RNA sequence: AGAUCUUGGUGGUAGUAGCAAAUAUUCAAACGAGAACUUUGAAGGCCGAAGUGGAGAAGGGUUCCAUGUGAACAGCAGUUGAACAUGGGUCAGUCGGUCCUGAGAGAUGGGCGAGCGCCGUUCCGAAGGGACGGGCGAUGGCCUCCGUUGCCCUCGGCCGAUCGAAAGGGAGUCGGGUUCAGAUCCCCGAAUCCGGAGUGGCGGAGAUGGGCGCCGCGAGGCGUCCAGUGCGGUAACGCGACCGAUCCCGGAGAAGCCGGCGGGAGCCCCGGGGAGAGUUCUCUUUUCUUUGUGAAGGGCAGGGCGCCCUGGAAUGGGUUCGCCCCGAGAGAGGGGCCCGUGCCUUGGAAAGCGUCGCGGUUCCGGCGGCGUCCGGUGAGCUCUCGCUGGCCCUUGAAAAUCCGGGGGAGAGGGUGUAAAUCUCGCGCCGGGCCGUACCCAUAUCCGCAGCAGGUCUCCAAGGUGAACAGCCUCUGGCAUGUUGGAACAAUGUAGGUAAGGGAAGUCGGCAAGCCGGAUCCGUAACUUCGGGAUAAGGAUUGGCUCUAAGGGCUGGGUCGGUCGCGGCCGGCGCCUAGCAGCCGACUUAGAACUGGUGCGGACCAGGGGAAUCCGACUGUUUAAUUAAAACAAAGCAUCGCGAAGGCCCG
RNA sequence: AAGCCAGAGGAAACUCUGGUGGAGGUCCGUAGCGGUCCUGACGUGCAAAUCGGUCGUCCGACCUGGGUAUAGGGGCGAAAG
C-alpha cells in the first residue's frame, strides 16, 4: 500500500480536518478535504422531529448563493413549517374563531333579559 | 525580480514598476526574505518581453 | 445541569409591544408541553398557574414562593419540595406559610407562587452506589466533592 | 466545463464576444469542438466525421481554429 | 516554528545579519586592536534571548 | 430460561455495593427504565429522558414527573387536593 | 605558611579509569598525500506499517541547498559533517492568521483609596451619532430628473467599550509539470467564492391576453373598454427567475459517550488478457512489478425518509442481528423529497504512467509506435455516510455569519414592443497585510552535550494468528548508535543447562523454575445468590487423503390456433413431496493412512489449594528510599441556616 | 445483567429448557498511564532518578495537548506536610 499525508498544517483529527481519499489522473491517492454535512431545516412548530422536505441541506453560508426556489416550498409557511402542522394551524385558526362567534351569540341571547 | 521597501504592498509595487520602467505588469507576488528585505516577483504583461526590458534596465 | 428540578420554557405575549417573551419557570410536577398556564390575580387554582398567595385557599400548596412581594421565586424550588398556605388575615395583608423545613413564615399576601409540587420526585431515594456517580453529580455543581476528614 | 448537446446552440457560443479560441480534437470515434469562453469551455461532440467536416468550415471568422494534431 | 509573527521574523533577521565575521580589511586599520568577531553565535551552542 | 434467581436488573452490578443497596436500587431502576403508557395518545412510549423529565416518542409530548416514576404518589394526592380546594373556592 | 582562605597557574594519580544499552558486517573500485569509518557497486543483515518509513503542531532560527577548506569542533578517524567560508533559497482571493465568541481578561459610569492605583462588568450613566420613510428647503449637477447635503418628523435595547483559540465556529482550488534547494503559492489547464457596477452590460422573466365597434371572402389588421407583482400537481411538492420596508417568528451555525447493523470508497485477496523483468541442474502456460481520470456541472444507480394519495386490517399482520410498527391508518399498489463522496459523461487524453525505439537543443514539458483490458469475491482492515438502540442524581458551548417564513407600509404602467422589479443565463472589474525553507528527534526542541530521559498528532502492506500481540517479509530507511584489532584469564553484567535429592538454603521459596493456547469432559466449601470459576482434576492437539453439514443466482409451461425460423391474445396445462443448470466463502464434525508418542514443536501463553489479619470493592497517595492496613468512596449519623440568613473572602 | 422469541411440565398458583440480547466504576491482556519486586543493573551513571525483566490498571473517579484561574504565611492538596 501507499501511505498518505495531510496537505495542510492542521495535523489533528478535528471536526474541520475531515478528509476523503481520491485518485488523481496521475494515478496517486491524495486527500480531498470534505465540506461539512449540511442539515435540512427543522419545523417551526417544534413538535415533529423530522426535517423539512424540498429544501437543499447545505451549510448556512451556502444558502446565500443558492436560488430562492431551492430554499423554500410553494406554500404558506413553505420552507419554515411542515405541511402537516400547517394543516393543523389552518383548522385551529378557523375553529377557534368559530368558537368566538359561538360564545358571542351565546351571550347575545343571554342579554335578552334584564 | 526586485528588492523593494518592506512597507510597499502589491498595489504600490505594481504602480512604481509601471511608471519608472514604462511597462505594464499583470500580477505581483511578494515574500519577505529571511534577512528582512522584501522581494517582489513582478510578472509582466504578455505583450512585454521580460528579457529586453531587463536589457535596458541593465541586468543582462 | 446541576439541578434535580426540571425547567419549563413558557412563552407569553408582551402586552405593550409586538413580541414574544420567553420565561424559564421551575417545572411543577404535572405540567406538560403544549399546556396553557395562567399568571395573575385572576388566575384560578390549577397546577402550574402563578397566582398570589393572598387569593389562595387556606390549605393549598405552592411551588416557587416569593420571599418578598415583587421579586421572583425564592422558596421551595429544589426538586420535590413545596410550601403550604396556612392562614391569611385581610387586615395588614399578611399570609402565614409552612416552608419545606417545617418553619412557619409570615409573608405578604401579594407574593406570587406556582401551584403544586415541583417536579423531580424523590431523587434522594436512589442510593448513589458509586464514588464515580458522586463524581459526576458534583462535577455539574462545583468543586466540593472529595471530602478529606 | 459545459457540454453542448446539439449544433446550432454551439454556433452562437462560438460567435460570442468572449470566445477566445476553438479547439478541434479528433478521436477514434468522435470529434470534439471546444470553444474557450470566459467562464466555461463548451465541448460539442459529433460522432459523424463528415458532420464535423461541415462544421469546421462553418466556424465564424476571426476566431482561432487551432487543431490539436 | 513555521508560524511566526512579523515582529519575531524581523528580530531573527537582524540576529542573522550580525552573525558574520569581521572583514579582512578591518585588521589593517591603524589602532585596530580587534582580532575577530567575539559576538558570534552558533544556533546550537547558545540560544537567542526570545 | 430464567437467567438469574433474584437479582433481576441489578445483576449488572455483580457482587458490589451490598445486597440491601442493590435491592433498594432494583425497584427504582425498574421503574426508571420502564415504558409507561402515554395518557395523551395511548401508546406505551412514555419513557424517561432526564431526571424529572418524561417524553413520549409517538406524540412528542414532554411532561414533568418524578425522578424515577412517571408521577409520584405525592403529586397525585396534591393534584386531587388542589381540585377539591378549587371546587371549594367557588360554589 | 596556614584561615575546608580569594584569584590564577601546575603536579602525582596517569598514558590510568575508561571510549561495553538496543544482533553486523564483508569484498572490489573511485577520489585522495593519507581510507575500518567518504562515495559507488556487489553480498550478508536490522527497523518490520503501534517503523530506524512518509508528513505536521510547539520549540529552534538559517541548522535548508550548492561550491570550497581541512586550522579548531564532531571524546578514534574522516577525503565526511547540523563545523568553517562564500553564495543562494520561503511567491496565495479560494493553506492559515486575520473575523466570532468560549473559560476568562478588562476600561468607562460609579465606589473605594494617603497614593501609585484597584473594586466592579451592568452594577448608582442623559450609555443609541444609525435608518430605506416623509417634510422644510437649499436646485449643488446631463438644474427632464434622480443622486449630494443641513434641520425637523418617525422608527431604532443585543442592556454595553474592548481583548480572548494558527486543534472550537468560520464562504470559496483542484489536476499536471517544474527547482540544487519553493510550490494546493511558480507555469500550464480546468474551476470557484466574496465585493462592485451611477450612466443600467446583453438577454430572459415580470408581460404582453380577452370583450365590443369596424375593416378585410376568410386568414389577417384598426379604434375603444377591461385585466394582467408567473405557472403546474388531489397531495407530498415541482418549474429558470417569481416586487416589497420597519417589525415579528423560526431554522442552520449547534453538539456527549458506548453498542449493533447496513451502504459507499480506498486497501487487501482470487481468475484471466497485455508490457517489462526473475528462475530454468530438473519442474514451473510459472514468480514479481505495472495495468489513471481532480474539482466543478449534467444524467443514472444506490442509501435513507417520523413525507403524500387510494384503501381499511383479528383467522391479527408486517419486520430486525436486536428491536420495533399499526383504526392517531398496518400489509399492498402508486408517488414525492433528501443525500448522492458511487457509475457514465464535459473536463479526458492533448495530460500521466508502462514499455519499444529515433533524433538531437553542453542540460528538449522533444518526436514516434503500442498499451493503459475483462471479470469474481468477503463477519476482511481503515475512513465515511445512514439507521436503530443503550447510559446518566453526568443531558454533553457561545457568538459572528447566513437563510426561510408571517405581515403588507409602500412602489410601479394605462395596453405601451410597457413600467417598478428579478435569489434566472451569460458578460465586465478587484481581492490589500502577515506567515510559508528546514528539523520535528537514540543529532536541528528541553535536559550545560550529537545525553539510553522527556516532548502533541495524521497514514499504515503480505504470512501466521483471536489479534494494531510476538516472529519473518515487501515499499521506504539505516549501518549497530561518540572507536577499532588480537585473544577467550579471574571477577563481573546478561542468558542457559545440570546426575541423585527436592527448600535440608534463607529472616522469609528472594531469585529461578512449574503451569500456560484451543476443543471435549468435570468442577468444592462458602456466598451479599451476582460469584467462587480458567476453581480443583482429566483427555486431545502433527502431516496427509477423504466424507458429510452449513449458501447464492437464474430457468420451472400444454401447444405455428401463425408471421410480428420470432412476437400480442388464447382452446391449449398441472412443477404445487420441488427440481435442472451455474457460481462461491470460510467453518465445523466424522473417518482412513502415516511418523523413533512427536505434534498450542518457534512465537504467543494463568502454578494451584487450605487458612489467619486489615481494608468492603473500583479509585488515590509521599515526582527522587514508604503503594500500604494510609486517603477517598457509596452508605450511616449529627450540626447550622428562610436571605436583614448560614459558612467564607475582603 | 435487563428486555425478547420458541418449546415443555403443571388443575390453577406457577415452574423449567434452548436460543436471542449485550449490561458492567466487569475479567485476561496490547498501546497508553503507573511503578510491585529483583532491595537486579548503574551508582565519579546514559541519566543531579535512568535502564532490564517482572509487574498494577487498561470504558473510566480513564489518558492527554493547548487556552484560562488561583501567588508565598498565600495558593492548591481523593491529605504524603
Ligand atoms: Mg473518481
Ligand atoms: Mg504572502
Ligand atoms: Mg471522608
Ligand atoms: Mg539545546
Ligand atoms: Mg601564600
Ligand atoms: Mg602563622
Ligand atoms: Mg585502559
Ligand atoms: Mg571499550
Ligand atoms: Mg526482521
Ligand atoms: Mg517520522
Ligand atoms: Mg545539509
Ligand atoms: Mg576526534
Ligand atoms: Mg555556519
Ligand atoms: Mg444601547
Ligand atoms: Mg478577537
Ligand atoms: Mg479552526
Ligand atoms: Mg520541500
Ligand atoms: Mg474520466
Ligand atoms: Mg404502507
Ligand atoms: Mg498516451
Ligand atoms: Mg514545508
Ligand atoms: Mg547518538
Ligand atoms: Mg535523546
Ligand atoms: Mg538552559
Ligand atoms: Mg526483532
Ligand atoms: Mg553491536
Ligand atoms: Mg561501528
Ligand atoms: Mg538437579
Ligand atoms: Mg532429574
Ligand atoms: Mg529452613
Ligand atoms: Mg538453617
Ligand atoms: Mg518470585
Ligand atoms: Mg478458591
Ligand atoms: Mg489426524
Ligand atoms: Mg483497598
Ligand atoms: Mg467493610
Ligand atoms: Mg517515592
Ligand atoms: Mg456500615
Ligand atoms: Mg474494568
Ligand atoms: Mg483488569
Ligand atoms: Mg503516582
Ligand atoms: Mg516506590
Ligand atoms: Mg537496587
Ligand atoms: Mg507526619
Ligand atoms: Zn410539525
Ligand atoms: Zn404519547
PDB file of N, CA and C (backbone and C1' of nucleotides) in Angstrom, chain G residues 50 104 321 323 449 494 510-511 617-620 622 630-632, chain H residues 4 21 25-26 30 37 39-40 47 49 61 67-68 78-80:
ATOM      1  P     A G  50       0.698   0.008  12.259  1.00  0.00           P
ATOM      2  O5'   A G  50       1.332   0.506  13.627  1.00  0.00           O
ATOM      3  C5'   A G  50       1.499   1.895  13.880  1.00  0.00           C
ATOM      4  C4'   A G  50       2.177   2.161  15.202  1.00  0.00           C
ATOM      5  C3'   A G  50       3.493   1.423  15.439  1.00  0.00           C
ATOM      6  O3'   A G  50       4.363   2.265  16.192  1.00  0.00           O
ATOM      7  C1'   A G  50       1.989   0.916  17.171  1.00  0.00           C
ATOM      8  P     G G 104     -15.502  31.947  34.042  1.00  0.00           P
ATOM      9  O5'   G G 104     -14.427  33.084  33.757  1.00  0.00           O
ATOM     10  C5'   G G 104     -13.180  33.086  34.430  1.00  0.00           C
ATOM     11  C4'   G G 104     -12.056  33.489  33.511  1.00  0.00           C
ATOM     12  C3'   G G 104     -11.650  34.950  33.546  1.00  0.00           C
ATOM     13  O3'   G G 104     -10.830  35.270  34.652  1.00  0.00           O
ATOM     14  C1'   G G 104     -11.809  34.232  31.307  1.00  0.00           C
ATOM     15  P     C G 321     -31.876  -9.247   9.928  1.00  0.00           P
ATOM     16  O5'   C G 321     -31.269  -9.567  11.361  1.00  0.00           O
ATOM     17  C5'   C G 321     -30.935 -10.893  11.734  1.00  0.00           C
ATOM     18  C4'   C G 321     -30.302 -10.925  13.098  1.00  0.00           C
ATOM     19  C3'   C G 321     -31.142 -10.359  14.228  1.00  0.00           C
ATOM     20  O3'   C G 321     -32.093 -11.278  14.728  1.00  0.00           O
ATOM     21  C1'   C G 321     -28.970  -9.456  14.347  1.00  0.00           C
ATOM     22  P     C G 323     -36.031  -8.895  19.454  1.00  0.00           P
ATOM     23  O5'   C G 323     -36.993  -7.636  19.610  1.00  0.00           O
ATOM     24  C5'   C G 323     -36.869  -6.745  20.705  1.00  0.00           C
ATOM     25  C4'   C G 323     -36.285  -5.428  20.265  1.00  0.00           C
ATOM     26  C3'   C G 323     -37.241  -4.252  20.178  1.00  0.00           C
ATOM     27  O3'   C G 323     -37.515  -3.658  21.433  1.00  0.00           O
ATOM     28  C1'   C G 323     -35.903  -4.321  18.239  1.00  0.00           C
ATOM     29  P     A G 449      23.365  21.950  26.246  1.00  0.00           P
ATOM     30  O5'   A G 449      24.335  20.902  25.548  1.00  0.00           O
ATOM     31  C5'   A G 449      25.524  21.324  24.893  1.00  0.00           C
ATOM     32  C4'   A G 449      26.269  20.162  24.286  1.00  0.00           C
ATOM     33  C3'   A G 449      25.449  19.276  23.353  1.00  0.00           C
ATOM     34  O3'   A G 449      26.282  18.799  22.301  1.00  0.00           O
ATOM     35  C1'   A G 449      26.271  17.984  25.154  1.00  0.00           C
ATOM     36  P     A G 494      22.489  -8.829  35.770  1.00  0.00           P
ATOM     37  O5'   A G 494      22.347  -9.446  34.312  1.00  0.00           O
ATOM     38  C5'   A G 494      21.586  -8.774  33.324  1.00  0.00           C
ATOM     39  C4'   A G 494      21.582  -9.522  32.016  1.00  0.00           C
ATOM     40  C3'   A G 494      21.069 -10.950  32.050  1.00  0.00           C
ATOM     41  O3'   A G 494      19.658 -11.042  32.076  1.00  0.00           O
ATOM     42  C1'   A G 494      23.049 -10.859  30.784  1.00  0.00           C
ATOM     43  P     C G 510       9.340 -15.917  47.425  1.00  0.00           P
ATOM     44  O5'   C G 510      10.432 -14.884  46.906  1.00  0.00           O
ATOM     45  C5'   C G 510      10.574 -13.606  47.506  1.00  0.00           C
ATOM     46  C4'   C G 510      11.960 -13.058  47.287  1.00  0.00           C
ATOM     47  C3'   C G 510      12.501 -13.183  45.870  1.00  0.00           C
ATOM     48  O3'   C G 510      12.078 -12.118  45.033  1.00  0.00           O
ATOM     49  C1'   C G 510      14.128 -13.936  47.424  1.00  0.00           C
ATOM     50  P     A G 511      11.516 -12.398  43.555  1.00  0.00           P
ATOM     51  O5'   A G 511      12.718 -13.121  42.810  1.00  0.00           O
ATOM     52  C5'   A G 511      13.832 -12.393  42.318  1.00  0.00           C
ATOM     53  C4'   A G 511      14.918 -13.334  41.870  1.00  0.00           C
ATOM     54  C3'   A G 511      14.511 -14.325  40.789  1.00  0.00           C
ATOM     55  O3'   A G 511      14.644 -13.796  39.483  1.00  0.00           O
ATOM     56  C1'   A G 511      15.520 -15.489  42.574  1.00  0.00           C
ATOM     57  P     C G 617     -11.491  -1.715  50.011  1.00  0.00           P
ATOM     58  O5'   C G 617     -12.150  -2.250  48.669  1.00  0.00           O
ATOM     59  C5'   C G 617     -11.938  -3.587  48.254  1.00  0.00           C
ATOM     60  C4'   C G 617     -12.869  -3.989  47.146  1.00  0.00           C
ATOM     61  C3'   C G 617     -12.602  -3.342  45.804  1.00  0.00           C
ATOM     62  O3'   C G 617     -11.546  -3.964  45.097  1.00  0.00           O
ATOM     63  C1'   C G 617     -14.905  -3.221  46.285  1.00  0.00           C
ATOM     64  C1'   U G 618     -13.024   0.197  41.529  1.00  0.00           C
ATOM     65  C3'   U G 618     -10.771  -0.474  41.314  1.00  0.00           C
ATOM     66  C4'   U G 618     -11.655  -1.699  41.437  1.00  0.00           C
ATOM     67  O3'   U G 618      -9.642  -0.672  40.485  1.00  0.00           O
ATOM     68  C5'   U G 618     -11.172  -2.770  42.379  1.00  0.00           C
ATOM     69  O5'   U G 618     -10.601  -2.217  43.554  1.00  0.00           O
ATOM     70  P     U G 618     -10.200  -3.152  44.774  1.00  0.00           P
ATOM     71  P     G G 619      -8.238   0.010  40.865  1.00  0.00           P
ATOM     72  O5'   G G 619      -8.604   1.534  41.128  1.00  0.00           O
ATOM     73  C5'   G G 619      -8.829   2.429  40.050  1.00  0.00           C
ATOM     74  C4'   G G 619      -9.307   3.766  40.547  1.00  0.00           C
ATOM     75  C3'   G G 619      -8.236   4.668  41.131  1.00  0.00           C
ATOM     76  O3'   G G 619      -7.524   5.383  40.141  1.00  0.00           O
ATOM     77  C1'   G G 619     -10.045   4.567  42.623  1.00  0.00           C
ATOM     78  C1'   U G 620      -5.832   7.936  45.032  1.00  0.00           C
ATOM     79  C3'   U G 620      -4.437   8.645  43.267  1.00  0.00           C
ATOM     80  C4'   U G 620      -5.877   8.619  42.794  1.00  0.00           C
ATOM     81  O3'   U G 620      -3.698   9.698  42.682  1.00  0.00           O
ATOM     82  C5'   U G 620      -6.113   7.939  41.475  1.00  0.00           C
ATOM     83  O5'   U G 620      -5.824   6.554  41.564  1.00  0.00           O
ATOM     84  P     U G 620      -5.946   5.608  40.293  1.00  0.00           P
ATOM     85  P     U G 622       2.334  11.318  45.067  1.00  0.00           P
ATOM     86  O5'   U G 622       3.649  11.293  45.959  1.00  0.00           O
ATOM     87  C5'   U G 622       4.125  12.492  46.543  1.00  0.00           C
ATOM     88  C4'   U G 622       4.904  12.255  47.811  1.00  0.00           C
ATOM     89  C3'   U G 622       6.074  11.295  47.737  1.00  0.00           C
ATOM     90  O3'   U G 622       7.212  11.857  47.113  1.00  0.00           O
ATOM     91  C1'   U G 622       4.862  10.960  49.749  1.00  0.00           C
ATOM     92  P     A G 630      -6.486   1.716  56.114  1.00  0.00           P
ATOM     93  O5'   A G 630      -5.372   2.847  56.065  1.00  0.00           O
ATOM     94  C5'   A G 630      -4.956   3.533  57.234  1.00  0.00           C
ATOM     95  C4'   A G 630      -4.130   4.732  56.863  1.00  0.00           C
ATOM     96  C3'   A G 630      -4.834   5.731  55.958  1.00  0.00           C
ATOM     97  O3'   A G 630      -5.558   6.702  56.693  1.00  0.00           O
ATOM     98  C1'   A G 630      -2.780   5.112  54.982  1.00  0.00           C
ATOM     99  P     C G 631      -7.151   6.827  56.550  1.00  0.00           P
ATOM    100  O5'   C G 631      -7.348   7.809  55.319  1.00  0.00           O
ATOM    101  C5'   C G 631      -6.902   9.152  55.382  1.00  0.00           C
ATOM    102  C4'   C G 631      -6.906   9.782  54.017  1.00  0.00           C
ATOM    103  C3'   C G 631      -8.231   9.722  53.278  1.00  0.00           C
ATOM    104  O3'   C G 631      -9.135  10.740  53.669  1.00  0.00           O
ATOM    105  C1'   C G 631      -6.519   8.986  51.845  1.00  0.00           C
ATOM    106  P     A G 632     -10.649  10.366  54.037  1.00  0.00           P
ATOM    107  O5'   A G 632     -11.408  10.416  52.643  1.00  0.00           O
ATOM    108  C5'   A G 632     -11.107  11.402  51.670  1.00  0.00           C
ATOM    109  C4'   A G 632     -11.409  10.889  50.287  1.00  0.00           C
ATOM    110  C3'   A G 632     -12.753  10.197  50.132  1.00  0.00           C
ATOM    111  O3'   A G 632     -13.794  11.117  49.866  1.00  0.00           O
ATOM    112  C1'   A G 632     -11.047   8.852  49.193  1.00  0.00           C
TER     113        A G 632
ATOM    114  P     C H   4     -40.097  -8.640  27.884  1.00  0.00           P
ATOM    115  O5'   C H   4     -39.745  -9.262  26.463  1.00  0.00           O
ATOM    116  C5'   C H   4     -39.938  -8.511  25.274  1.00  0.00           C
ATOM    117  C4'   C H   4     -39.313  -9.193  24.086  1.00  0.00           C
ATOM    118  C3'   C H   4     -39.791 -10.606  23.804  1.00  0.00           C
ATOM    119  O3'   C H   4     -41.022 -10.638  23.105  1.00  0.00           O
ATOM    120  C1'   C H   4     -37.433 -10.528  23.679  1.00  0.00           C
ATOM    121  P     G H  21     -27.875 -11.786  19.113  1.00  0.00           P
ATOM    122  O5'   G H  21     -28.272 -10.740  20.243  1.00  0.00           O
ATOM    123  C5'   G H  21     -29.207  -9.700  20.004  1.00  0.00           C
ATOM    124  C4'   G H  21     -29.535  -8.991  21.290  1.00  0.00           C
ATOM    125  C3'   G H  21     -28.337  -8.403  22.014  1.00  0.00           C
ATOM    126  O3'   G H  21     -28.099  -7.071  21.601  1.00  0.00           O
ATOM    127  C1'   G H  21     -29.651  -9.696  23.520  1.00  0.00           C
ATOM    128  P     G H  25     -20.845  -0.980  37.538  1.00  0.00           P
ATOM    129  O5'   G H  25     -19.574  -0.064  37.293  1.00  0.00           O
ATOM    130  C5'   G H  25     -18.268  -0.601  37.386  1.00  0.00           C
ATOM    131  C4'   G H  25     -17.231   0.445  37.088  1.00  0.00           C
ATOM    132  C3'   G H  25     -15.862   0.197  37.694  1.00  0.00           C
ATOM    133  O3'   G H  25     -15.066  -0.655  36.894  1.00  0.00           O
ATOM    134  C1'   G H  25     -16.532   2.471  38.012  1.00  0.00           C
ATOM    135  P     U H  26     -14.231  -1.849  37.557  1.00  0.00           P
ATOM    136  O5'   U H  26     -15.287  -3.023  37.724  1.00  0.00           O
ATOM    137  C5'   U H  26     -16.102  -3.441  36.645  1.00  0.00           C
ATOM    138  C4'   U H  26     -16.170  -4.942  36.571  1.00  0.00           C
ATOM    139  C3'   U H  26     -14.931  -5.628  36.023  1.00  0.00           C
ATOM    140  O3'   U H  26     -13.911  -5.784  36.991  1.00  0.00           O
ATOM    141  C1'   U H  26     -16.843  -6.498  34.957  1.00  0.00           C
ATOM    142  C1'   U H  30      -1.916  -4.566  23.885  1.00  0.00           C
ATOM    143  C3'   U H  30       0.203  -3.860  24.633  1.00  0.00           C
ATOM    144  C4'   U H  30      -0.102  -5.223  25.215  1.00  0.00           C
ATOM    145  O3'   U H  30       1.581  -3.687  24.367  1.00  0.00           O
ATOM    146  C5'   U H  30       0.151  -5.362  26.689  1.00  0.00           C
ATOM    147  O5'   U H  30      -0.262  -6.628  27.157  1.00  0.00           O
ATOM    148  P     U H  30      -0.177  -6.997  28.697  1.00  0.00           P
ATOM    149  P     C H  37       8.518  -2.852  46.400  1.00  0.00           P
ATOM    150  O5'   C H  37       9.235  -4.195  45.941  1.00  0.00           O
ATOM    151  C5'   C H  37       8.910  -5.439  46.537  1.00  0.00           C
ATOM    152  C4'   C H  37       9.416  -6.586  45.703  1.00  0.00           C
ATOM    153  C3'   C H  37      10.911  -6.591  45.438  1.00  0.00           C
ATOM    154  O3'   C H  37      11.640  -7.178  46.497  1.00  0.00           O
ATOM    155  C1'   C H  37       9.745  -6.959  43.414  1.00  0.00           C
ATOM    156  P     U H  39      17.641  -9.833  45.706  1.00  0.00           P
ATOM    157  O5'   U H  39      16.921  -8.679  46.520  1.00  0.00           O
ATOM    158  C5'   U H  39      17.645  -7.559  46.992  1.00  0.00           C
ATOM    159  C4'   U H  39      16.892  -6.294  46.704  1.00  0.00           C
ATOM    160  C3'   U H  39      17.729  -5.087  46.340  1.00  0.00           C
ATOM    161  O3'   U H  39      18.147  -5.120  44.993  1.00  0.00           O
ATOM    162  C1'   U H  39      16.045  -4.467  47.878  1.00  0.00           C
ATOM    163  P     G H  40      19.701  -5.018  44.632  1.00  0.00           P
ATOM    164  O5'   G H  40      19.785  -5.641  43.176  1.00  0.00           O
ATOM    165  C5'   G H  40      19.947  -7.035  42.981  1.00  0.00           C
ATOM    166  C4'   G H  40      20.078  -7.349  41.517  1.00  0.00           C
ATOM    167  C3'   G H  40      20.882  -6.343  40.711  1.00  0.00           C
ATOM    168  O3'   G H  40      22.280  -6.541  40.803  1.00  0.00           O
ATOM    169  C1'   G H  40      18.847  -6.728  39.620  1.00  0.00           C
ATOM    170  P     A H  47      25.434  10.704  31.803  1.00  0.00           P
ATOM    171  O5'   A H  47      24.018  10.955  32.483  1.00  0.00           O
ATOM    172  C5'   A H  47      23.029  11.739  31.836  1.00  0.00           C
ATOM    173  C4'   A H  47      21.659  11.493  32.414  1.00  0.00           C
ATOM    174  C3'   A H  47      21.495  11.800  33.894  1.00  0.00           C
ATOM    175  O3'   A H  47      21.192  13.165  34.134  1.00  0.00           O
ATOM    176  C1'   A H  47      20.554   9.677  33.395  1.00  0.00           C
ATOM    177  P     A H  49      17.888  13.379  37.312  1.00  0.00           P
ATOM    178  O5'   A H  49      17.117  11.999  37.457  1.00  0.00           O
ATOM    179  C5'   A H  49      17.598  10.823  36.819  1.00  0.00           C
ATOM    180  C4'   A H  49      16.847   9.595  37.270  1.00  0.00           C
ATOM    181  C3'   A H  49      15.329   9.734  37.307  1.00  0.00           C
ATOM    182  O3'   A H  49      14.728   8.494  36.954  1.00  0.00           O
ATOM    183  C1'   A H  49      16.132   9.219  39.472  1.00  0.00           C
ATOM    184  P     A H  61     -17.071   6.464  35.924  1.00  0.00           P
ATOM    185  O5'   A H  61     -16.124   7.628  36.441  1.00  0.00           O
ATOM    186  C5'   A H  61     -15.567   7.565  37.744  1.00  0.00           C
ATOM    187  C4'   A H  61     -14.602   8.688  38.008  1.00  0.00           C
ATOM    188  C3'   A H  61     -13.175   8.404  37.560  1.00  0.00           C
ATOM    189  O3'   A H  61     -12.531   9.595  37.110  1.00  0.00           O
ATOM    190  C1'   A H  61     -13.229   8.707  39.912  1.00  0.00           C
ATOM    191  P     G H  67      -0.987  27.577  25.852  1.00  0.00           P
ATOM    192  O5'   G H  67      -2.471  28.128  25.969  1.00  0.00           O
ATOM    193  C5'   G H  67      -3.075  28.833  24.898  1.00  0.00           C
ATOM    194  C4'   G H  67      -4.500  29.179  25.225  1.00  0.00           C
ATOM    195  C3'   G H  67      -4.694  29.933  26.522  1.00  0.00           C
ATOM    196  O3'   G H  67      -4.444  31.315  26.383  1.00  0.00           O
ATOM    197  C1'   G H  67      -6.240  28.159  26.410  1.00  0.00           C
ATOM    198  P     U H  68      -4.039  32.171  27.669  1.00  0.00           P
ATOM    199  O5'   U H  68      -5.420  32.351  28.429  1.00  0.00           O
ATOM    200  C5'   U H  68      -5.451  32.519  29.830  1.00  0.00           C
ATOM    201  C4'   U H  68      -6.758  32.058  30.411  1.00  0.00           C
ATOM    202  C3'   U H  68      -6.820  32.086  31.922  1.00  0.00           C
ATOM    203  O3'   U H  68      -7.067  33.377  32.435  1.00  0.00           O
ATOM    204  C1'   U H  68      -7.595  30.007  31.170  1.00  0.00           C
ATOM    205  P     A H  78      -8.070  16.883  46.470  1.00  0.00           P
ATOM    206  O5'   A H  78      -8.548  15.419  46.855  1.00  0.00           O
ATOM    207  C5'   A H  78      -8.588  15.009  48.210  1.00  0.00           C
ATOM    208  C4'   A H  78      -8.512  13.511  48.337  1.00  0.00           C
ATOM    209  C3'   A H  78      -7.209  12.872  47.888  1.00  0.00           C
ATOM    210  O3'   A H  78      -6.244  12.915  48.924  1.00  0.00           O
ATOM    211  C1'   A H  78      -9.053  11.683  46.985  1.00  0.00           C
ATOM    212  P     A H  79      -4.684  12.622  48.673  1.00  0.00           P
ATOM    213  O5'   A H  79      -4.209  12.072  50.090  1.00  0.00           O
ATOM    214  C5'   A H  79      -2.874  12.232  50.550  1.00  0.00           C
ATOM    215  C4'   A H  79      -2.821  12.819  51.943  1.00  0.00           C
ATOM    216  C3'   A H  79      -3.759  12.197  52.976  1.00  0.00           C
ATOM    217  O3'   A H  79      -3.133  12.222  54.257  1.00  0.00           O
ATOM    218  C1'   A H  79      -4.216  14.501  52.781  1.00  0.00           C
ATOM    219  P     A H  80      -2.223  10.998  54.753  1.00  0.00           P
ATOM    220  O5'   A H  80      -0.873  11.182  53.940  1.00  0.00           O
ATOM    221  C5'   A H  80       0.222  10.304  54.127  1.00  0.00           C
ATOM    222  C4'   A H  80       1.492  10.924  53.616  1.00  0.00           C
ATOM    223  C3'   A H  80       1.832  12.283  54.196  1.00  0.00           C
ATOM    224  O3'   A H  80       2.440  12.213  55.473  1.00  0.00           O
ATOM    225  C1'   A H  80       2.059  12.353  51.849  1.00  0.00           C
TER     226        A H  80
END
